[PDB]
Design a protein around this nucleic acid. Structure first.
Lengths: 175, 138, 133, 123, 36
RNA sequence: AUACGUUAAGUGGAAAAGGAUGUGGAGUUGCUUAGACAACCAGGAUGUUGGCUUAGAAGCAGCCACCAUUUAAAGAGUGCG
């Protein structure tokens, strides 16, 4: 019935520092993160279990308390399993291939398209259709996924450019 | 569209509204009825605008009730005419209205349809209004 | 699986069957003899037939009874029912006559019991406006 | 809550006279798959068989408190209880087993129910 | 569209205030609305 | 300044019909550890589109008698089709 009261197990190996005030430097094989935390929140570390508690039932605190747990769960999973977001290109002549760390995109614009990933992020291209942006940061992987989407806004009339897998673009009837 | 067959005088004083309604505050002829929160003049055309809105949405159903028959003329001097030089002429008619009065009534209608017919009437009427039901202590 | 109302007495021309089952990979020449076989017992009637589609292009078919409530017009003795059922009780039928009708519909009906098969037909007789007596 | 008592008291009346029963998982419970079982009930008997998926631990397990005290282990996750009235046991243990083997709903590897004081292995 | 009296049009519509301005959002683009 | 609160927009320091999961109080009521709202995994009715119809349109031209059974459950129909 509530969000932040729920326990979060650590599968391991993920250590969690408790440095003030308040910075949480999660660490592990995949990477590290330091989410900002205002003092009113109270993070505690049970053995292999992160915990969060609400100072009061006030409505402002009710909103912030449910966010802090969801972020920490996003943090640990990126330090372990990691994250990725597919992108289904659709069309005829559309294609994509890397040139160094940079990701060239042969979008239908006459101007060539290029996007540079930020550090800690890589973009493999297993196929010309699919696109995969691996990364330990959900906020960043979803941001890069948006920036790539920005190159081509989807057309309701026809499947073209970037498209989430899977998602149903609204059908339209031309004439 | 409702006008008197005859009136004793062609014109009358505009008057001064104040206080609770003299009567008719309690709906009973109909299962439900609109009740004004304040008091303001209502032209005859405004009344016709409300009843037409209900007859369409109600479709088949019980007869619309109208507790209020207009009787007080509103004077309307012709445009650009200078002040004084006689009183103007009654362009139309306006019913006196008091707060808490039952402006309209409806009966024999299902509870869902009744909520809407009272609502559309509320928009045609400048006065703020509220949902009302019959009391039976009783 | 594509259901169709192939006539019992005939099965060969393209426009009733043809491409519509021919795109299913069905071998039309080999089954038309089968439609004329078992359905010969009820010739002159339009018999619906379910058609399952196996991956191996093997096929097995299941014939069905002629459509319900058409029989009700016969038991009533009237060619057509009221356009205003219950409000206009044009016809009446005995409960025992309904028993003769429900038994014919048994292979088509999914009804668990003959007593339940009665109640199924009773909902059809009311559609005609016919009184149940 | 009076309606819930009808859910309880009636099913207990069957279990007091019950002979045999079998575990059935509710996952992927297609309606067509149910009809294939329901037609089998029409052969074995009529309305006497019961499908009732009232399988809450707070529900059916309380019915098991009087008799059949082996349902406590089978209680977690989806269940589809069955009850017999008359009908000498035989095919009922066998018919459902044949269905799950040909797709259509996981059998749960037959957790088993009352017969003696045992669980697994339909006969 | 922008109207002072934004209202839901269909069940899919949802009322969500944003930046001090109430906005109704729906799977159908036409039903999207903002007051003020 | 003291004490109990309220307000977040600069309202305070500019109006209205109307609109809104803004927020603080009060009351009434449905369901609810013989199980609630969220879900995530299950299935969607059987004769049947059923009567009257429009070329045909079967959950749906629309007007309706809109029936009873299979039952853990489902309207001969909530909806996008």
């Amino acid at each position: 019935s509530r969000v932040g009261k729920k326990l979060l197990e650590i599968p391991s190996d993920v250590t969690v520092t408790l440095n003030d005030n308040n910075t949480v430097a999660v660490k592990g094989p995949k990477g590290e993160l330091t989410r900002t935390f205002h003092p009113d929140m109270e993070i505690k570390v049970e053995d292999n279990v992160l915990t969060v508690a609400r100072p009061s039932d006030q409505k402002e605190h009710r909103a912030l308390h449910g966010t802090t747990r969801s972020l920490l769960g996003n943090m640990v999973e990126g330090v372990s399993k990691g994250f990725e977001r597919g992108l289904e290109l659709v069309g005829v002549g559309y294609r994509a291939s890397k040139s160094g760390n940079k990701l060239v995109l042969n979008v239908g614009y006459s101007h060539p398209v290029e996007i540079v990933p930020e550090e800690g992020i890589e973009i493999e291209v297993p196929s010309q259709t699919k696109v995969v942006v691996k990364g330990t940061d959900k906020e960043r992987v979803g941001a890069i996924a948006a920036n790539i989407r920005a190159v081509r806004s989807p057309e309701p009339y026809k499947g073209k450019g970037i498209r989430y897998e899977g998602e149903v673009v609204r059908r339209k009837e031309g004439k | 569209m409702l006008l008197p067959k005859r009136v004793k005088y062609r014109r009358e004083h505009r008057g001064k509204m104040r206080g609770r309604a003299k009567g008719g505050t309690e709906v009973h002829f109909g299962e439900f009825g609109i009740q004004a929160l304040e008091a303001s003049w209502i032209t005859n055309r405004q009344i016709e605008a409300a009843r037409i809105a209900m007859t369409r949405y109600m479709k088949r159903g019980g007869k619309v009730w109208i507790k209020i028959f207009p009787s007080k003329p509103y004077t309307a001097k012709p445009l650009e005419v200078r002040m004084g030089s006689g009183k103007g002429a009654p362009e139309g008619w306006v019913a006196v209205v008091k707060p808490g009065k039952v402006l309209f009534e409806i009966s024999g209608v299902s509870e869902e349809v009744a909520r809407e017919a009272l609502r559309l009437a509320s928009h045609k009427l400048p006065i703020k209004t509220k949902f009302v039901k019959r009391e039976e202590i009783g | 699986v594509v259901k169709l109302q192939i006539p019992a007495g005939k099965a060969n021309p393209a426009p009733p069957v043809g491409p519509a089952l021919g795109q299913a990979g069905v071998n039309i020449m080999g089954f038309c003899k089968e439609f004329n076989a078992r359905t010969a017992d009820q010739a002159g009637l339009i018999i619906p037939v379910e058609i399952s589609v196996y991956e191996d292009r093997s096929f097995t078919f299941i014939t069905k009874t002629p459509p319900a409530a058409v029989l009700l017009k016969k038991a009533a003795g009237i060619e057509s029912g009221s356009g205003e059922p219950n409000r206009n009780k044009v016809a009446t039928v005995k409960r025992d006559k309904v028993r003769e009708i429900a038994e014919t519909k048994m292979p088509d009906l999914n009804a668990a019991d003959v007593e339940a098969a009665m109640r199924m037909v009773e909902g059809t007789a009311r559609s005609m406006g016919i009184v149940i007596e | 809550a009076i309606e819930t008592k009808k859910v309880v008291v009636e099913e207990i009346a069957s279990k007091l006279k019950e002979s045999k029963s079998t575990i059935i998982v509710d996952y992927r419970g297609l309606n067509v798959s149910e009809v294939t079982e329901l037609r089998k009930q029409l052969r074995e008997a009529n309305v006497e068989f019961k499908v009732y998926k009232n399988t809450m631990t707070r529900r059916a397990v309380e019915q098991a408190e009087l008799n059949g005290l082996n349902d406590f282990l089978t209680g977690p996750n989806a269940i589809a209880f069955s009850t017999e009235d008359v009908v000498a046991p035989a095919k009922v243990l066998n018919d459902f087993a044949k269905n799950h083997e040909a797709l259509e709903i996981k059998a749960g590897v037959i957790e088993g129910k009352v017969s003696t004081v045992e669980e697994v292995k339909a006969l | 569209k922008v109207r002072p009296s934004v209202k839901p049009i269909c069940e899919k519509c949802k009322v969500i205030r944003r930046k001090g301005k109430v906005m109704v959002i729906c799977e159908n683009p036409k039903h999207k609305q903002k007051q003020g």
